[PDB]
């Protein structure tokens, strides 16, 4: 799963090497099976989904829609992210989870990972709602 940096000229072929690798791997799996419980799960944030659709013109695939920041899906994973880092009991996650729709769920993780740094810089042992709010503002400054 790649958003960061590529040449897209020679890098497209560089990725095409890995695509060829998983291609021949799928050719081995389709060819025969030595043992069960063998699967592969990939991810793509870009047009390389359609490129994979070009490499796999409707042969073997499993399609699952993945909307960014769906909601109820934001809450539980926000709790999961709140398990590792220190968080008080007087904070409301609902509205701060509902404060960033229509964009993505990565903004939430950004808000969290930053809130850790915010709490460390403000010398706080815990994270508050105002921290999450300001973090939301900061991550919405870019978008």
């Amino acid at each position: 799963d790649s958003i960061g940096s590529s040449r897209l000229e020679g890098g497209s072929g560089g990725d095409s090497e890995v695509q060829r690798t998983m291609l021949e791997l799928l050719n081995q799996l389709d060819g025969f099976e030595a043992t069960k419980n063998i699967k592969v799960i990939m991810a793509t944030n870009r047009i390389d989904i359609l490129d994979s659709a070009l490499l796999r013109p409707g042969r073997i695939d499993r399609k699952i829609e993945f909307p960014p920041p769906n909601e109820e899906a934001r809450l539980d994973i926000l709790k999961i992210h709140s398990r590792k880092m220190n968080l008080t009991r007087g904070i409301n996650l609902r509205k701060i989870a509902e404060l960033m729709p229509g964009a993505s769920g990565a903004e939430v993780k950004g808000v969290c990972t930053e809130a850790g740094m915010y709490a460390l810089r403000e010398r706080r042992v815990h994270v508050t709602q105002e921290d999450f709010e300001m973090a939301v503002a900061k991550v919405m400054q870019k978008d």
């Binding site: 930053e114 740094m117 810089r121 403000e122 300001m134 900061k138």
Partner: protein, 80 residues
């Protein structure tokens, strides 16, 4: 062995000379500065601009010197 230079300024010289202010406003200073586009070059003009605006240690890159026959030198170099 007007908005661009202001945003960059606030993303460079303001975090440099101001700490406790950022602690008061509760805002973490941005580390990165991003550029884009084929016509836009940058990478020089802005660096020299910051160099003239603020006086400090600046590190300019000659490209990648860490790619060699020895792969163990790189991590130690960037660590140094």
């Amino acid at each position: 062995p007007d908005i661009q230079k202001q945003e960059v300024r606030e993303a460079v010289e303001l975090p440099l000379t101001h700490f406790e202010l950022y602690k008061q406003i509760g805002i973490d200073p941005p580390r990165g500065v991003l550029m884009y586009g084929p016509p836009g070059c940058g990478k020089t003009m802005l660096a020299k601009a910051v160099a003239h605006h603020t006086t400090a240690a600046f590190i300019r890159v000659v490209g990648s010197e860490f790619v060699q026959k020895y792969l163990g030198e790189g991590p130690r170099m960037v660590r140094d």
